[PDB]
Design a protein around this ligand. Structure first.
Ligand SMILES: *[C@@H]1O[C@H](CO)[C@@H](O[C@@H]2O[C@H](CO)[C@@H](O[C@@H]3O[C@H](CO)[C@@H](O)[C@H](O)[C@@H]3O)[C@H](O)[C@H]2NC(C)=O)[C@H](O)[C@H]1NC(C)=O
Ligand SMILES: *[C@@H]1O[C@H](CO[C@@H]2O[C@@H](C)[C@@H](O)[C@@H](O)[C@@H]2O)[C@@H](O[C@@H]2O[C@H](CO)[C@@H](O)[C@H](O)[C@H]2NC(C)=O)[C@H](O)[C@H]1NC(C)=O
Ligand SMILES: *[C@H]1[C@H](O)[C@@H](O)[C@H](O)[C@@H](CO)[C@@H]1NCCCCCCCCn1cc(CCCCN)nn1
Ligand SMILES: *[C@@H]1O[C@H](CO)[C@@H](O[C@@H]2O[C@H](CO)[C@@H](O)[C@H](O)[C@H]2NC(C)=O)[C@H](O)[C@H]1NC(C)=O
Ligand SMILES: *[C@@H]1O[C@H](CO)[C@@H](O[C@@H]2O[C@H](CO)[C@@H](O)[C@H](O)[C@H]2NC(C)=O)[C@H](O)[C@H]1NC(C)=O
Ligand SMILES: *[C@@H]1O[C@H](CO)[C@@H](O)[C@H](O)[C@H]1NC(C)=O
Ligand SMILES: [Cl-]
Ligand SMILES: [Cl-]
Ligand SMILES: [Cl-]
Ligand SMILES: [Cl-]
Ligand SMILES: [Cl-]
Ligand SMILES: [Cl-]
Ligand SMILES: [Cl-]
Ligand SMILES: [Cl-]
Ligand SMILES: [Cl-]
Ligand SMILES: [Cl-]
Lengths: 110, 741
């Protein structure tokens, strides 16, 4: 579960200085670097979102994403909508949004 | 065969998007590598990268190719003199990733929130944003040039500058009267230095306020600018975003009218947020408010009725604040004190700017901060179109993705140091990849005192910046070209002469940027991606496909070592150029490093075999140079072939391409002949005279040279250099045939 090559470790404490005990309580792996590389990092089993109800559209795909276990950040959005748009032969476009609330989007012309 | 270049699949648990290149099966994106985080103020999406080679994520002082050794890149627009490891004036959440063999793809995260991008050596990347949504574009290329074009199809093709904007610009903080400003033009002219655009910094203002001029040093400001126009020059001046809030009510129209129309960013109680900048207490226009755009258009048009300036230099538009947040501090809320603070200088989103929870028309400043500069550039582009009725010229410090559709950029408060001269090449190349081709650094440097040797090398390299301005800080020693020793002046005058001769070519490169999303200044890897030796080259640049520039970037050097991709590269010193004032001819490369002589009076420039460059005769302004006869430089392949083009219009009108108000000509060399192909001929370009054709790589002396079947008045052949120089009397707009045998 914690046998992750050093260069492939993703930081499980990007927010604060963490102790081993606090790292393990988040469900993360604690392995000091040998001399940067994060000491606290995600095991492959760290809770993410699950894909559900993947559906085909004329433009591409839509799905629901569901998180069952909260993260260490406040106000996780536990239900997300995925939209995948095959716009041109050279351009792929996907969005992940909160289907229950309009969130800020950068103004952009079509 | 009809199919996308990409294939897409999904991991169910944990969730991930997987994007393959169809042609070779290469995994370009794989978000399964790390958990998806999506909280109100924290988004994280990770991917594998296909190689250790990645560029983009401006604005930072770094090599063109970013370090994957546990690097944290912060996007939060900030007023800071360029220095490594810091968030600087702009934010461009786009990368281009190279793939083994020379294919590439691009990724754009359309998100304007404060963010960290973390690169690790697996190799992998994590986007960490403080708000908004995940809105991701993948561009399949496969050529690096095609990735850039595909990105610019989404964010906008670069704007077409006026021809005069490609001339030399001269500015300093400290030209404290119209008498002094006029002496700069007189001193440049007397020493035969081209100068298209005279600038002023904040010296012109009355008590440091926008849309005023003082009645001491600048009493006759309107007359000074009218006189520049009579001599064939243009005028630029600084405009800051912040508006003095302290003056008596009714005494300062920009504030009085701004208040009436509700144009300003507001605070929790609904009043204008008050910061501190040059005037003292100031309000900040909200350029997301349609009414603020109307007010800005009115202020610019009214000021232009007093002083007919030709463009706007928008500085301090991060927005920059001399104090933290506001005169009244910032409230304690989750926008001012968010659960994840990216690696910003000062450790707070408020440092050197305004409160994050302040109110704009579209959203909070928290969400819109990284667009502030861009929204001011859009407002100013529109204001200048309405005030002048010709192409706008906006140069902006702060930028976001899509900036290049509206304005240009300069790299800010760079030190007068050899390190910052060297660092300017990667930064100018990076902004070209990001669709901001009208970019440059302050020639000779801004902060501190330049040296004569540094200012010679900086002018040599700076003559190849698409935007070329010498600008200088208030407390610095003078660095105008006429302020140096005679030998230094000769070297600087040669650099400006060569840039002016190449302006028809540089203008055609901007035309290709504007119509096809091409780069103007481009790294060697964009042109020769299948040669992996080019991937780490960022101290050389190309203009387009054909002109390779290898500058000296260190003190005390009389040579430089540069990379030459496989091919023949002709020394541009073998092409004759006329100047108003006072070595192998060809490199045959297999793809190798070559040491070149580079004495102080020299910058190495080579022309790629198979290309034709249009050139124009000399002038101290583009008003003069544009009336001169033209010349061609024809670089033959071993097989006797070459191709080039010329785009010509009136140099400043709007809607030229839509109205067809241009001339476009292709030049072709084949079998000891040069011809033109007329793509479009109109009244603009009809009178263009071709008086000189220089052919490089002519292996044997010709016995006859003909123009339209008749022996030419004169030609010279140099057996040492293999150059054929031909005098002709032709018109770019009428079919000709030049031949030799
Ligand atoms: C929102 O912005 C407004 C400005 O548009 C802020 O108004 C400022 O409010 C402070 C007090 O909270 C005023 O300071 C006071 O000045 C008077 C006399 O000048 C002095 O007697 C008091 O002791 C105090 O220093 C300040 O004058 C006023 N500024 C202006 C230009 O009117 C307001 O505080 C801001 N609201 C928040 C919540 O930040
Ligand atoms: C995944 O989808 C199922 C089915 O949803 C239905 O069919 C879809 C195509 C769409 O048209 C929906 O509007 C339909 O409701 C969801 O399971 C259903 O959940 C609803 C509401 O709780 C319930 O009334 C139904 O009985 C369920 N139907 C079945 C067949 O189980 C499911 O909730 C979706 N999953 C997620 C995580 O959103
Ligand atoms: C923008 C650009 O970068 C340059 O090219 C221009 O030449 C500059 C002038 O227009 C410009 N940057 C100017 C930066 C000025 C730095 C001032 C530092 C402020 C420190 N300060 C002020 C205060 C009190 C508020 C006083 C309000 N007048 N406290 N600390
Ligand atoms: C995308 O990345 C994921 C996660 O790194 C890869 O999935 C892992 O592959 C390893 C090695 O084959 C397996 O032993 C693990 O069980 C996989 N993890 C998960 C969560 O499935 C996956 O191979 C990558 N996909 C592609 C096509 O490269
Ligand atoms: C323009 O050039 C003139 C002439 O060189 C400069 O005026 C001289 O400046 C020196 C200082 O280095 C004075 O001691 C001399 O008295 C000046 N000579 C004359 C003839 O007036 C002038 O400073 C230059 N102006 C600018 C703005 O560069
Ligand atoms: C620039 O030169 C001036 C004049 O000698 C001097 O006062 C100033 O300190 C110099 N600045 C730097 C950074 O060396
Ligand atoms: Cl510990
Ligand atoms: Cl915790
Ligand atoms: Cl919570
Ligand atoms: Cl690298
Ligand atoms: Cl291919
Ligand atoms: Cl709204
Ligand atoms: Cl919002
Ligand atoms: Cl090599
Ligand atoms: Cl080397
Ligand atoms: Cl003719």
């Amino acid at each position: 579960q914690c046998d992750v090559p050093p260069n492939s470790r993703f930081d499980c404490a990007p927010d604060k200085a963490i102790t081993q005990e606090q790292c393990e309580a988040r469900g993360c792996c604690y392995i000091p670097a040998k001399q940067g590389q994060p000491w606290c990092f995600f095991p492959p089993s760290y809770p993410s979102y699950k894909l559900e109800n993947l559906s085909s559209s004329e433009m591409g795909y839509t799905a629901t994403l569901t998180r069952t276990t909260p993260t260490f950040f406040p106000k996780d959005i536990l239900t997300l909508r995925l939209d995948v748009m095959m716009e041109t032969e050279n351009r792929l476009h996907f969005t992940i949004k909160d289907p229950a609330n309009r969130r800020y989007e950068v103004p952009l012309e079509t | 065969a009809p199919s996308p270049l990409y294939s897409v699949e999904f991991s169910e648990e944990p969730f991930g998007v997987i994007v393959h290149r169809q042609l070779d099966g290469r995994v370009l994106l794989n978000t399964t590598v790390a958990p998806l985080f999506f909280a109100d103020q924290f988004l994280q999406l990770s991917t594998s990268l296909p190689s250790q080679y990645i560029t983009g994520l401006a604005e930072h002082l770094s090599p063109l190719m970013l370090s994957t050794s546990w690097t944290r890149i912060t996007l939060w627009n900030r007023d800071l003199a360029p220095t490594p490891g810091a968030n600087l004036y702009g934010s461009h959440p786009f990368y281009l990733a190279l793939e083994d063999g020379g294919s590439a793809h691009g990724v754009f995260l359309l998100n304007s929130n404060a963010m960290d991008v973390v690169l690790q050596p697996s190799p992998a990347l994590s986007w960490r944003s403080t708000g908004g949504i995940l809105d991701v574009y993948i561009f399949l290329g496969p050529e690096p040039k095609s990735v850039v074009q595909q990105y610019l199809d989404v964010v906008g093709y670069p704007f077409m500058p006026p021809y005069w904007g490609l001339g030399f610009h001269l500015c300093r903080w400290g030209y404290s009267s119209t008498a002094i400003t006029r002496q700069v033009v007189e001193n440049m002219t007397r020493a035969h230095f081209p100068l298209d655009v005279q600038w002023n910094d904040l010296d012109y203002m009355d008590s440091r306020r926008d849309f005023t001029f003082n009645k001491d040093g600048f009493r006759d400001f309107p007359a000074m600018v009218q006189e520049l126009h009579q001599g064939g020059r243009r005028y630029m001046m600084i405009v800051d975003p912040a508006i003095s809030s302290s003056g008596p009510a009714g005494s300062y129209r920009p504030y009085d009218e701004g208040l009436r129309r509700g144009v300003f960013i507001t605070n929790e109680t609904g009043q204008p947020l008050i910061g501190k900048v040059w005037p003292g207490s100031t309000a900040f226009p909200d350029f997301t408010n349609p009414t603020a755009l109307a007010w800005w258009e009115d202020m610019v048009a009214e000021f232009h009725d007093q002083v007919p300036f030709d463009g706007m230099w928008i500085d301090m538009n991060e927005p920059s604040n001399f104090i933290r947040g506001s005169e009244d501090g910032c409230p304690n809320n989750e926008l001012e004190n968010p659960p994840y603070v990216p690696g910003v200088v000062g450790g707070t989103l408020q440092a050197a700017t305004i409160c994050a929870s302040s109110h704009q028309f579209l959203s909070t400043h928290y969400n819109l901060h990284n667009l502030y500069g861009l929204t001011e550039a859009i407002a100013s582009h529109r204001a200048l179109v309405k005030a002048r009725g010709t192409r706008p010229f906006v140069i902006s410090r702060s930028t976001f993705a899509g900036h290049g559709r509206y304005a240009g950029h300069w790299t800010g408060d760079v030190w007068s140091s050899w390190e910052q001269l060297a660092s300017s090449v990667p930064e100018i190349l990076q902004f070209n990849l990001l669709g901001v081709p009208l970019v440059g650094a302050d020639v000779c440097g801004f902060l501190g005192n330049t040296s004569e040797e540094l200012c010679v090398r900086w002018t040599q390299l700076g003559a190849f910046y698409p935007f070329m301005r010498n600008h200088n800080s208030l407390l610095s020693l003078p660095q105008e070209p006429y302020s140096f020793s005679e030998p230094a002046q000769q070297a600087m005058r040669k650099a400006l002469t060569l840039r002016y001769a190449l302006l028809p070519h540089l203008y055609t490169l901007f035309h290709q940027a504007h119509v096809a999303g091409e780069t103007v200044a481009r790294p060697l890897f964009l042109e020769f991606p299948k040669d992996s030796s080019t991937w780490t080259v960022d101290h050389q640049l190309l203009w387009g496909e054909a002109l390779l520039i290898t500058p000296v970037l260190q003190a005390g050097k009389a040579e430089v070592t540069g990379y030459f991709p496989l091919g023949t590269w002709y020394d541009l010193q073998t092409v004759p150029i006329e100047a108003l004032g006072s070595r192998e001819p060809a490199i045959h490369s297999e793809g190798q490093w070559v040491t070149l002589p580079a004495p102080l009076d020299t910058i190495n420039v080579h022309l790629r075999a198979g290309y034709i460059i249009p050139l124009q005769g000399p002038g101290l302004t583009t008003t003069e140079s544009r009336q001169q006869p033209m010349a061609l430089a024809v670089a033959l392949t071993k097989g006797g072939e070459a191709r080039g083009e010329l785009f010509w219009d009136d140099g400043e009108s709007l809607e030229v391409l839509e109205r067809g108000a241009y001339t476009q000509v292709i030049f072709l060399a084949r079998n000891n002949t040069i011809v033109n192909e007329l793509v479009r001929v109109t009244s603009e370009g009809a009178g263009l005279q071709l008086q000189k054709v220089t052919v490089l790589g002519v292996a044997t002396a010709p016995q006859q040279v003909l123009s339209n079947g008749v022996p030419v008045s004169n030609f010279t052949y140099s057996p040492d250099t293999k150059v054929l120089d031909i005098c002709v009397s032709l018109l770019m707009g009428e079919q000709f045939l030049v031949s030799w045998c």
